[PDB]
Amino acid sequence: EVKIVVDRDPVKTSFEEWARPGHFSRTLAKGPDTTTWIWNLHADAHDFDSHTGDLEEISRKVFSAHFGQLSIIFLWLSGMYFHGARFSNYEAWLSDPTHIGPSAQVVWPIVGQEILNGDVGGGFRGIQITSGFFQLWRASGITSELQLYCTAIGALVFAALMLFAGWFHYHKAAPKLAWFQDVESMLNHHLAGLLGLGSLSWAGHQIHVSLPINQFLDAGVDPKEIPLPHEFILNRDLLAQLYPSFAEGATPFFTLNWSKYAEFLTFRGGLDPVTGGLWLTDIAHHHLAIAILFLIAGHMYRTNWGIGHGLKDILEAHKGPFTGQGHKGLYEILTTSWHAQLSLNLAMLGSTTIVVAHHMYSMPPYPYLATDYGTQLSLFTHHMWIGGFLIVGAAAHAAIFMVRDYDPTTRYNDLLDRVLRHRDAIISHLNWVCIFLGFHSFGLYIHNDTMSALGRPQDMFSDTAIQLQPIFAQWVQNIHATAPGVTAPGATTSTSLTWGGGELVAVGGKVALLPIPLGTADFLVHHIHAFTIHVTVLILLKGVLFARSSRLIPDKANLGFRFPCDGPGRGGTCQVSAWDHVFLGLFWMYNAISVVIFHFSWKMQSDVWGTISDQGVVTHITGGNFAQSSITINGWLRDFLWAQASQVIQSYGSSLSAYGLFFLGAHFVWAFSLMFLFSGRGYWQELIESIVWAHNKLKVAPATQPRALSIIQGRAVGVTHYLLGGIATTWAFFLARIIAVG
Amino acid sequence: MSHSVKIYDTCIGCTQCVRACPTDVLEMIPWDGCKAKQIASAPRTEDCVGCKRCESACPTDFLSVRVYLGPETTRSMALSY
Amino acid sequence: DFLVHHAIALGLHTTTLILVKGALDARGSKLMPDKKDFGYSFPCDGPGRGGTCDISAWDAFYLAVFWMLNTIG
Amino acid sequence: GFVPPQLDPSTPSPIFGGSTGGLLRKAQVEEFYVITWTSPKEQVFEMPTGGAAIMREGPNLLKLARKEQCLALGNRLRSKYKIAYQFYRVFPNGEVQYLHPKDGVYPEKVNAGRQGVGQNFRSIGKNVSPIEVKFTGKNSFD
Amino acid sequence: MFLISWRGYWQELIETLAWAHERTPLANLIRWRDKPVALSIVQARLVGLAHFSVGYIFTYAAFLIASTSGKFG
Amino acid sequence: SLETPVTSSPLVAWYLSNLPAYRTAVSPLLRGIEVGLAHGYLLVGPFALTGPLRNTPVHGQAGTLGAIGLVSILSVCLTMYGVASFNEGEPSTAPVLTLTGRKKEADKLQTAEGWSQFTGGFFFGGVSGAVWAYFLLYVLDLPYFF
Amino acid sequence: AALYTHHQYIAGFIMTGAFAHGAIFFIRDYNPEQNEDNVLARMLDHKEAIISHLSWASLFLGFHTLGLYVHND
Amino acid sequence: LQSKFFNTFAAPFTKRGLLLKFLLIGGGSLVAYVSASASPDLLPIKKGPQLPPTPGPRGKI
Ligand SMILES: CC1=C(/C=C/C(C)=C/C=C/C(C)=C/C=C/C=C(C)/C=C/C=C(C)/C=C/C2=C(C)CCCC2(C)C)C(C)(C)CCC1
Ligand SMILES: CC1=C(/C=C/C(C)=C/C=C/C(C)=C/C=C/C=C(C)/C=C/C=C(C)/C=C/C2=C(C)CCCC2(C)C)C(C)(C)CCC1
Ligand SMILES: CC1=C(/C=C/C(C)=C\C=C\C(C)=C\C=C\C=C(C)/C=C/C=C(C)/C=C/C2=C(C)CCCC2(C)C)C(C)(C)CCC1
Ligand code: SF4
Numbered sequence A: 001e002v003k004i005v006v007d008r009d010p011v012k013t014s015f016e017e018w019a020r021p022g023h024f025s026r027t028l029a030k031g032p033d034t035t036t037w038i039w040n041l042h043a044d045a046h047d048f049d050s051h052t053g054d055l056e057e058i059s060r061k062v063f064s065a066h067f068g069q070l071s072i073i074f075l076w077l078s079g080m081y082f083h084g085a086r087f088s089n090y091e092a093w094l095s096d097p098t099h100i101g102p103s104a105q106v107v108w109p110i111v112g113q114e115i116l117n118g119d120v121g122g123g124f125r126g127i128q129i130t131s132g133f134f135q136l137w138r139a140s141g142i143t144s145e146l147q148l149y150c151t152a153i154g155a156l157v158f159a160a161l162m163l164f165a166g167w168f169h170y171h172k173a174a175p176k177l178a179w180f181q182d183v184e185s186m187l188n189h190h191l192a193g194l195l196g197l198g199s200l201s202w203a204g205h206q207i208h209v210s211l212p213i214n215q216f217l218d219a220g221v222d223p224k225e226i227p228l229p230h231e232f233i234l235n236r237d238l239l240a241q242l243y244p245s246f247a248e249g250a251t252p253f254f255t256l257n258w259s260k261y262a263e264f265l266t267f268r269g270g271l272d273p274v275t276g277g278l279w280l281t282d283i284a285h286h287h288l289a290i291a292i293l294f295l296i297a298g299h300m301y302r303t304n305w306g307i308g309h310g311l312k313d314i315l316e317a318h319k320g321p322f323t324g325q326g327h328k329g330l331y332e333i334l335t336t337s338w339h340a341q342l343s344l345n346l347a348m349l350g351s352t353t354i355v356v357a358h359h360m361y362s363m364p365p366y367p368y369l370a371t372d373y374g375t376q377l378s379l380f381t382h383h384m385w386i387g388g389f390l391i392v393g394a395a396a397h398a399a400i401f402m403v404r405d406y407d408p409t410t411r412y413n414d415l416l417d418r419v420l421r422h423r424d425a426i427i428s429h430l431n432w433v434c435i436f437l438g439f440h441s442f443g444l445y446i447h448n449d450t451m452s453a454l455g456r457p458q459d460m461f462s463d464t465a466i467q468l469q470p471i472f473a474q475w476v477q478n479i480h481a482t483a484p485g486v487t488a489p490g491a492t493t494s495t496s497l498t499w500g501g502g503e504l505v506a507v508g509g510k511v512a513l514l515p516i517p518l519g520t521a522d523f524l525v526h527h528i529h530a531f532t533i534h535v536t537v538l539i540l541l542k543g544v545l546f547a548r549s550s551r552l553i554p555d556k557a558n559l560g561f562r563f564p565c566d567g568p569g570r571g572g573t574c575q576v577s578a579w580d581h582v583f584l585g586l587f588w589m590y591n592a593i594s595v596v597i598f599h600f601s602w603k604m605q606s607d608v609w610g611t612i613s614d615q616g617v618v619t620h621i622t623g624g625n626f627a628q629s630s631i632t633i634n635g636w637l638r639d640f641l642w643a644q645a646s647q648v649i650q651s652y653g654s655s656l657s658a659y660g661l662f663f664l665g666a667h668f669v670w671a672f673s674l675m676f677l678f679s680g681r682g683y684w685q686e687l688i689e690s691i692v693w694a695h696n697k698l699k700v701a702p703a704t705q706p707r708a709l710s711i712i713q714g715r716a717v718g719v720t721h722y723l724l725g726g727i728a729t730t731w732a733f734f735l736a737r738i739i740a741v742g
Numbered sequence B: 001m002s003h004s005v006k007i008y009d010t011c012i013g014c015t016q017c018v019r020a021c022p023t024d025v026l027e028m029i030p031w032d033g034c035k036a037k038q039i040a041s042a043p044r045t046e047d048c049v050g051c052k053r054c055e056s057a058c059p060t061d062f063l064s065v066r067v068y069l070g071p072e073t074t075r076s077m078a079l080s081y
Numbered sequence C: 001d002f003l004v005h006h007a008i009a010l011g012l013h014t015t016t017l018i019l020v021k022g023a024l025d026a027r028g029s030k031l032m033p034d035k036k037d038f039g040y041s042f043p044c045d046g047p048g049r050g051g052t053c054d055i056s057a058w059d060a061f062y063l064a065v066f067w068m069l070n071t072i073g
Numbered sequence D: 001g002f003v004p005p006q007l008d009p010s011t012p013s014p015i016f017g018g019s020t021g022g023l024l025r026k027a028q029v030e031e032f033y034v035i036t037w038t039s040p041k042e043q044v045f046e047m048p049t050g051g052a053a054i055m056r057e058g059p060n061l062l063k064l065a066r067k068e069q070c071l072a073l074g075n076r077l078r079s080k081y082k083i084a085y086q087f088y089r090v091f092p093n094g095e096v097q098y099l100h101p102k103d104g105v106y107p108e109k110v111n112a113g114r115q116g117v118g119q120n121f122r123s124i125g126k127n128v129s130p131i132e133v134k135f136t137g138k139n140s141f142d
Numbered sequence E: 001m002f003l004i005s006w007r008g009y010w011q012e013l014i015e016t017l018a019w020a021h022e023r024t025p026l027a028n029l030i031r032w033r034d035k036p037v038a039l040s041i042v043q044a045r046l047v048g049l050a051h052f053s054v055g056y057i058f059t060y061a062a063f064l065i066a067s068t069s070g071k072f073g
Numbered sequence F: 001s002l003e004t005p006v007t008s009s010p011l012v013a014w015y016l017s018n019l020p021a022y023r024t025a026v027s028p029l030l031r032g033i034e035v036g037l038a039h040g041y042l043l044v045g046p047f048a049l050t051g052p053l054r055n056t057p058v059h060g061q062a063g064t065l066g067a068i069g070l071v072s073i074l075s076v077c078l079t080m081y082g083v084a085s086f087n088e089g090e091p092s093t094a095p096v097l098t099l100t101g102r103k104k105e106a107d108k109l110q111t112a113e114g115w116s117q118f119t120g121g122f123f124f125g126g127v128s129g130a131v132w133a134y135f136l137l138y139v140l141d142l143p144y145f146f
Numbered sequence G: 001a002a003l004y005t006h007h008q009y010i011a012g013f014i015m016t017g018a019f020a021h022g023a024i025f026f027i028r029d030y031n032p033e034q035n036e037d038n039v040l041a042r043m044l045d046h047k048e049a050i051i052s053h054l055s056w057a058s059l060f061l062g063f064h065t066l067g068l069y070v071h072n073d
Numbered sequence H: 001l002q003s004k005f006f007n008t009f010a011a012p013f014t015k016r017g018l019l020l021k022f023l024l025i026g027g028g029s030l031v032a033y034v035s036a037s038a039s040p041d042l043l044p045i046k047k048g049p050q051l052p053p054t055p056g057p058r059g060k061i
């Protein structure tokens, strides 16, 4: 069956190699005859599958690499907790979080950057932050710098431990194949073990530490004399004072009359007006139910005993009439090629990151989070960016799998075979859908702008003119606002407040959430999003499906994954490798994310965020001009892009001045990218040649023969600089604007 | 005749082009101007698609087989429709 | 005005560089010494031997028009 | 030249569902190609334009759009299973032409009998400047 | 769009579009006279440069006229 | 090639074979005028209802004349395509083989003169369909919504 | 403003066309033997020095004009 | 039955070059006449602004 088989001490911890670069690649280890060697060295370091031919060694290598990654993550967490401990105003922030700006970074007074340590309130000076740690540290009842300090220490310990574990598992006790390739027990554990018990232990930490101290702070007390956590579990009488049921030990649970615990485990829903956040009772019930669900899920597959399924015994049964034999053998494909798994997991992880970004703003989990505007905004846009990048990586590695490790002779399948057998139909129909959406979602904006600039407003696309109504969205919102009436009696309000029914939650003269109406502008922006997503999918899916062989080049696969072209023959064959398909799709994903985040910023600052008067009149941060100025590109310039770019541009000579400076460098690089994206190579090669002559004239010609970057590396550096410029520009814009006005 | 191929006496008769010719254009013929006593030849330039992969192989001083471009045709363009 | 005049001189000199490189190196450099037999505007000379994208002198004029527009702007 | 053609017959086709990589208007109006080989055993092979299919015993017959795909498949069959092959061209009049070997022996190696179409007996640097030949039909490489 | 995305991508896309239009009923009756092929490489560079210049002139010309017409001073 | 239920089925082949563009058992001019009147009845609707004079009591005649103009433009385009692609004494390029394999007479619809008859029929039919849609939309006009 | 911008952009375009057609003259009509050792054929012999010095002026002006700007900023 | 009417009431419309001539000259004449005879009620151009316009900055010039 399945056992603990491993091997002993393959590679010794000897520095013999560190002084010899490129030991892994036979060609690289010979020596740098030119300068392209030092590019090619970094370029293929992590390329494990091109260093061997057996999956055992590359599996060991990736097992060690995961430990390296985890060590870096732990070190980052430790740095964060430290800087919170020794360099923040966290205690003053806890004193009253309504109007005290979270700052967690000071700068040394050397070169005039003292102005960076701007006024943040609470007798502190420091660069304001928007990471949003403080809402978490108030949720977990840290409420003391000693806790941050010791947590940073423990994080450092875990980091060193993981680094050790890595070194040991690669060098000394290397796992074997029948361990890795055994996915049944891995699924079994990770379902039951990691996620379930994780959520369970967190529910523990919440019901036994957070809930009481948070309730006390909501009652209003200086956290100095707030009783320490362990003094809430050792002596029961405190929790007894809080929750009568909680003073009944464990009888009401075991004896199946769970309703007694109804006080601290409940299903209220909505938000908590004391902090706008979620009712921690609800989130505790959530984490606990999720723990139980993962535990009961974990027991699916047979591992050693006689019960349970087998991932081979599940696929082959499914075989429909149209497709034929079904998923037979697919189990072998997804167990014999790492790149396949990397692609699948990257896709699912990007999608989950996006849905996390979405669910965050509309249901603020933490307390006093939906009122620190910049934090909410920055979190949402960061998660969106991460999701986009993960998705593109998924597509790229899927293409790499399609090229290298796919083969019908032994890694056969009858499903993917059919899929590839009609690729042309797929790409054609997706292309036509892309054209259709492009037309009927952007030409609408063009028509609206034109009919505006021609003095014919009553022929526009808006509520006051020829009208388009997003009826399905309002239908769903009505349903979600009337569902807690009959369908979900156990709830108290709608699942969130953004559903089109209820009241508004406002703390400290500022609003946090309220109903959200949808106008024709929302219809148009949603169709823009749909179109751009469809085009990115078109690019990447075409790349994957045509990575093997196209009707232009018959044997593309033999030429490898990443090569620049196939010469200028047959009318020119530039950018045919799947690698170049990903190079293209990157820009379109960037554009999709950019327009999405702009739409989000405008919609929030024009319909939700803002301040509330003493009487109750709302005056939003931007005045609520969305439904009347999002329908013209010229509007986007005037109402949003130009106007709300003030705070970044007057930012010189103030605390926010750093956000100003980047706003130029971001643009600059942004420029710079074109120089690599537009030019070619031969020109630069000849220029380098003349420069080498000019040097050689002075007996300075270096033996590391200069060489203009190879084509693929040129495109890579170009796209990297371009993404950097764009993202840094929107980053500076967002931070400066929101943290200045809000 | 759409494109055009040329071969020059710096041919060392190493025979990499033919092995890398995608559409069966070149071949070798008995010569007396190298050890291998064989030089290139292009009697099938009609199907010459135009990719430089052939002369991307010739490891001579500068080159020994050139691919000069010209007008276009239906087969010199990889057309399949 | 001094700083702007210096930027203008930068643009002038670099655009001149682009065009003069396109002119003198048109007959051929060590990357393609027999370029003078390919006529003026050609796609390229193959992806091998280091890659030869944007090597025609037409391509030099191409890469110069950008800087011309920039300097005049 | 004792190197006669083989006059491609009509023999069965490989087992394949038929897919969007087949022929188009071009093949039906201008020209197409047919590759033919004898196989040692029913195995699996990836067609040039999509997916994979199985071959049969004895001689095979596959049709394709352009010569490049045929020759790519032939090089695959020669480097993967060590079998010989031919491929023929067809015209809508009914003509059939024999293209690849032209003697039976690969063009990879020497076989006297081939003429010398397109040689220049001078190094590459000896070519002349277009001004010396302008306003004429001639070019430098001729 | 023309300075970045080079030909082969669009060539394959045109291949797919050609097959599509070919195997579609009610349109296969209508034939084409020139086989659709994506533009050449130097042709790409040229049209991309033309677009760049046209935009970079229109933008600044309209701005220059408007900024001093709205104020005349 | 692939043959899904879409591209291959009794009802779909039946329908596509019954519409005028393939029933070779009729004169090409008549198929042309039939498709013309079809598209004529077709296009009047949105052009009229959503035109730039819809808020005016003339919107009917306006949309109808616009439809007629578009029909005329497309008939011009048809004749132009025909004179471009079809020579005047050369053979046809229509599919002369059916599904079974019955060698079909070269479709006179796919001839220069046949294409000309088709174009003329289509133009006349489009005009008739447009005026018919007008007379049925602005005289006998109860059971509709517009 | 309109007239000044007009004439300046036209001058820039013509100036680019000048070197373009010069490179064309070298590619198509320059004869070696009819120009042996003359100033024209004397230019080509040291194109490297010219290109290098133009690149040096470009690098100097660029580096310092960008440095000063970033410092002031 | 209907075939004879369809033939006769569109009989001169069969010659193709004649057809191009007729369609083009008729379209030109028709559009020229309808635009020259455009009524101001349906076209905001066939009538003037009919209001006192605004003076530009710096007086009037
Ligand atoms: C995504 C991500 C993140 C997050 C993360 C997290 C948050 C995680 C969590 C995790 C978790 C949450 C985990 C948990 C775990 C748990 C465990 C691992 C447990 C264990 C346990 C045990 C082992 C026990 C045992 C026992 C005892 C001792 C008693 C009872 C009985 C028994 C025997 C069972 C961040 C952003 C940061 C970064 C990036 C990435
Ligand atoms: C101080 C002063 C003065 C003087 C002035 C002067 C004297 C000036 C000069 C100036 C100059 C002196 C300028 C120059 C310029 C130049 C240029 C601008 C050039 C150009 C060139 C080119 C364009 C070339 C072309 C070509 C080529 C490329 C190759 C060969 C062919 C050809 C020739 C075509 C006076 C006393 C009177 C007065 C006061 C002030
Ligand atoms: C001092 C010096 C100099 C100069 C320099 C310069 C002039 C510079 C510039 C620069 C510029 C003109 C610009 C820049 C820019 C930069 C940037 C722009 C960066 C960035 C970075 C980062 C790291 C970012 C990041 C991020 C974001 C923000 C987004 C996404 C997320 C993350 C976090 C990744 C000279 C030569 C005299 C000499 C040497 C030294
Ligand atoms: S060119 Fe290179 S490859 Fe072709 S024949 Fe002469 S030597 Fe052999």
Ligand code: SF4
Pocket: A564, A565, A566, A567, A568, A572, A573, A574, A575, A680, A711, C043, C044, C045, C046, C047, C051, C052, C053, C054, E006, E041
């Ligand atoms: S030049 Fe650069 S891009 Fe154009 S084909 Fe040759 S390699 Fe591909």
